[PDB]
C-alpha cells in the first residue's frame with residue numbers, strides 16, 4: 442500500500458522504463474504448453490480466433506456426448522484466484538455454433554455468476570454472439586431451459602438475472618447473475634479507473650454471496666485482454682482489502698501460465714497499477 446506508491450513511482454520513472462521491462466519479462470510465460478486438442482480439425486469451427494486457444498493442461502472439458510469424440514471441447518480455461526485453484530473460467534465470446542456448449546459448461550460447472558466485458562458488436566465488428574435471451578420468454582439451449590428474469594441497463598454496465606434448469610428436473614433450477622460491462626474498448630482500457638473499480642466491487646460482492654458456487658465465468662471476445670485485466674483487478678483489490686501486499690506481476694504471471702496473452706497490452710498493465718494507486722489515494726486522503 443504505502444510501499445506500492447513508491448514502487449509504482451519507480452516503475453513510471455524514465456517514461457515507464459521499468460514498467461515496460463517488467464511487462465516484457467512476462468511475454469513468454471506459459472507459452473511452451475501444447476494446444477493440441479484445440480487444433481483438432483473437428484474443433485476448428487469452435488474457436489473464434491486461430492491464435493487464441495486453450496492449453497491442454499488447463500482447458501475446461503464438457504461431458505462427452507456419444508458418437509462424437511470431440512464433443513468435450515470448448516474454448517475455455519480454468520484460472521486460479523486468491524482462494525481457489527479453479528476460481529474463474531475464462532472463455533471466448535460464444536459463437537452461434539458454440540452457445541449451446543457455453544450454457545452446458547455454465548450448468549455443468551455450477552456457475553452462478555457470469556462477467557462479460559465486451560459488447561456484441563464494436564466499431565462494426567462482431568465480437569460476441571447475443572447468447573442469452575432477448576426477452577422474458579424462456580427458450581432451450583440444447584437440453585437446458587433459460588429464462589431472463591430481470592435486466593437493468595445503466596450507461597456503463599447492465600446486470601441481468603437468468604433462471605437455468607435441466608429439462609428432466611425442473612425443480613432443480615439455479616439463479617445466474619450476468620454482469621455486462623459495456624464501455625470497455627477492445628485492446629484498450631476504460632476512460633476512468635473509478636468505473637471499473639466500482640464494477641469489479643459490484644461483482645465481487647455478489648460472488649461472495651454464493652460461497653458454494655463453481656467458478657466465476659469471465660469473458661470478452663477472445664477471453665484474454667479485457668478478461669485478464671478484470672481478473673487481475675479483482676484479485677488485487679481483494680489483496681488490498683485483506684491488508685495483504687498487492688502483487689500485480691504475480692497475478693498476471695499466474696494468469697499467463699493458464700491461458701495465453703492474459704492482459705493483452707502494456708497499457709492494460711499500466712491501468713492495473715493506476716487502479717491500485719487511485720484506491721490508495723482515496724483511502725490515504727482520510728488516514
Ligand SMILES: Cn1cc(-c2onc(C(=O)O)c2CO)c2ccccc21
Nearest residue numbers: 490492661662663665666667702705
Ligand atoms: C486475434 N486476437 C484477438 C485478441 C484479443 O485479446 N483480448 C481480446 C478482448 O476481447 O479483449 C481480443 C479480441 O480482439 C488477441 C490477443 C493476442 C493475439 C491475438 C489476438
